[PDB]
Every structure is written in C-alpha cells, then in structure tokens.
Ligand binder design. Sequence first.
Ligand SMILES: NC(=O)c1ccc[n+]([C@@H]2O[C@H](COP(=O)([O-])OP(=O)(O)OC[C@H]3O[C@@H](n4cnc5c(N)ncnc54)[C@H](O)[C@@H]3O)[C@@H](O)[C@H]2O)c1
Ligand SMILES: [Cl-]
Ligand SMILES: [Cl-]
Ligand SMILES: [Cl-]
Ligand SMILES: [Cl-]
Ligand SMILES: [Cl-]
Ligand SMILES: [Cl-]
Length: 324
Amino acid sequence: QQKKTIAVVNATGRQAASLIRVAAAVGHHVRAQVHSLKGLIAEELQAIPNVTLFQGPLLNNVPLMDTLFEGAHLAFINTTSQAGDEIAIGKDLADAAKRAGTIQHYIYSSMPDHSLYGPWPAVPMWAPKFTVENYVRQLGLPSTFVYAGIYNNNFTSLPYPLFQMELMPDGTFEWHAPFDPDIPLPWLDAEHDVGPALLQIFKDGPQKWNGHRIALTFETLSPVQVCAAFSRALNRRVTYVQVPKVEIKVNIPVGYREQLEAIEVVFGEHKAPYFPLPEFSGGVISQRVTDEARKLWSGWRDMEEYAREVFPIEEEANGLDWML
Ligand SMILES: NC(=O)c1ccc[n+]([C@@H]2O[C@H](COP(=O)([O-])OP(=O)(O)OC[C@H]3O[C@@H](n4cnc5c(N)ncnc54)[C@H](O)[C@@H]3O)[C@@H](O)[C@H]2O)c1
Ligand SMILES: [Cl-]
Ligand SMILES: [Cl-]
Ligand SMILES: [Cl-]
Ligand SMILES: [Cl-]
Ligand SMILES: [Cl-]
Ligand SMILES: [Cl-]
C-alpha cells in the first residue's frame, strides 16, 4: 500500500497546487512540471521534500513529458490556453503517459463544449479541453475526467473582469455580471477542495472511475445567493446586478476577451447551464450535480466560509484596505 508517484503539469495553478500539497502530506512523491521555478507557489512547492519540479514549456516539448511520467503511476493533468495549442499539448501529454506504460489512472481536468447541447457557441477556453477528453478516452489506459466549478476565489475587489466584488464609495459591495440573478451556478473552493477530491478518486481506483465524468463542485448558488453569503460573512451590504456585457475595466489578452464574449452569449443571453451535459442536469431520487464530489470529500468548504475567512486575507495580500 505504498503511496504511488503522481505526475502533474502547471503545478503552480490552483488545481494542481491543491493536489500537490495534500498528496505530498500523505506520502505521495510528486513529479511536477512548472513553466518557471520562480514565484511564491513554485518556491513553496520546491521546498516540499516529496515534490520534484521539472521546469520548462509543455509546447513542443515531448521530452519534458517523457521525463515527467518516468516512474509515475498516477497522473492529474490540467492544461491552459496560455501557450495556445492546448489540444496538441493535451494530446501529447496523454500519449506520453500511455508511452510510459506505468500510468494506472490518468485524471484529466475537462470542460464542456456548449455548442453540442444547444443553440449556443462553444466557450473558447473550455471546448478545447473536451476535445482532449475525447482523445484520452480512446487511449489504452484508465482515465477519469473532472469538471471544475467556478472558483470561490475568482472573487476580488481589484478591477478584474466577471468576478469583481466591487467596493462602493459607501462601503457596500456589488457584483455585476451577465449571469441570471436566480439560476444556481456550481462553485468550488479550488485551494482547499480540489486536492482531497482528486486523491479520493485515485484511492477509489481505475475500475470504479474509468470513463467517468465528475463535476468538481460542492455547492450550487445563484448570484443572489453568493452575494447573500458574502453579506452574512462580512456584515456588509452585498448585492448582485445583472449586466448584459461584462464590465472590462482593465486591459486583457484577446483570448480572454473572446472567452468573456462567449460567456455573455451563453449565460447572459441564453441562460444556458454551466455544466450543459445531460448527466450534470416514491423513493425515486435523482442525482444532484454535487453528489459525487461531496461523497469524495466530506470536508469541503462553502462560499460563506471563503468570504469570511479567506477573502479578507487575499484582499489584504493584494493591497486592499477595506478590512483595515
Ligand atoms: N477560474 C475558474 O473558475 C475555472 C473553472 C473551471 C475551469 N477552469 C480552468 O482552469 C484552468 C487553469 O488552471 P488553474 O486554475 O489550476 O490555474 P491558475 O489560473 O490558478 O494559474 C495558472 C498558472 O499557470 C502559469 N502558466 C500556465 N501556462 C503558462 C504559460 N504558457 N507561460 C507562463 N506561465 C503559465 C501562470 O503563471 C499561473 O500561475 C483554465 O484552463 C480554466 O479554463 C477555471
Ligand atoms: Cl496510491
Ligand atoms: Cl506552472
Ligand atoms: Cl513560476
Ligand atoms: Cl523538493
Ligand atoms: Cl480508455
Ligand atoms: Cl489595464
């Protein structure tokens, strides 16, 4: 029963970092790729004895992938669009894993392609991952796909798009977005809950989870309910305002702009589900989107805890002063 070695990429990202911290603490050795060794998170992870970092780009660097998977038995792969070529990278990684011959369970962090379920456009930073998921499914090794809910800690009072908990002149907070005020959205405390859930999937094993899609969300809340949780947590007035166009108050990469534009159409105009797949939609009991995740990890944290216990600290660390 010796803890198996786990290979991961984008180690400094919230999903991977969450898994690495808890995995290492319970005995797993981790082989982790990082784009660069500098930075608070990379430095923190390098200081963990059970962790070995491998710095370099994923883009057109299969050699790094072969190195990463050498001696690994488990994998948790979450890519990004940063370098472009996310589909090619996700496929290269999967091929490298299969090539290693030792990967018993490959978990890929996937997202939906909304254009497959309704008269909706594909959200650009999500649809590509589904393509990688389809490719991975065809490979001869067990694989499981996790779909991340919206991160509680996307929220900030800095003028960043879509998830700004704006501090008003009078001390009150307002969150403006295209999401319908009352339709429940899936949320996730990435930092605390992704790691433990992923570890449980690995503990459960490939026979139980091969071919499965798991919604990594532990609570659903409408925008109005999110604001009410921040209000209870902070003892301040927090209200939601639905706006057709995302308020883009800072310069952003074009790819992100296109992501936001698709979101205005999908959620603003169409009010489509965040998880549009059929399976995520006397005595008879239908499965709720949060069922599997909660069964995987019972110690999950809600939005109210985030708002009251973590948000003030993240905000202070970002230089904000409202909590002073
Ligand atoms: N924020 C959410 O609510 C949410 C929900 C579902 C899915 N996702 C998906 O999560 C993915 C990101 O994963 P994450 O949340 O674990 O990470 P992250 O957003 O926490 O950070 C990514 C890290 O990767 C580094 N990085 C990645 N590619 C790089 C490159 N080519 N050059 C330099 N640095 C690079 C960045 O500096 C950064 O520190 C995205 O593809 C997104 O679509 C996010
Ligand atoms: Cl193990
Ligand atoms: Cl990284
Ligand atoms: Cl870095
Ligand atoms: Cl180390
Ligand atoms: Cl398969
Ligand atoms: Cl700017």
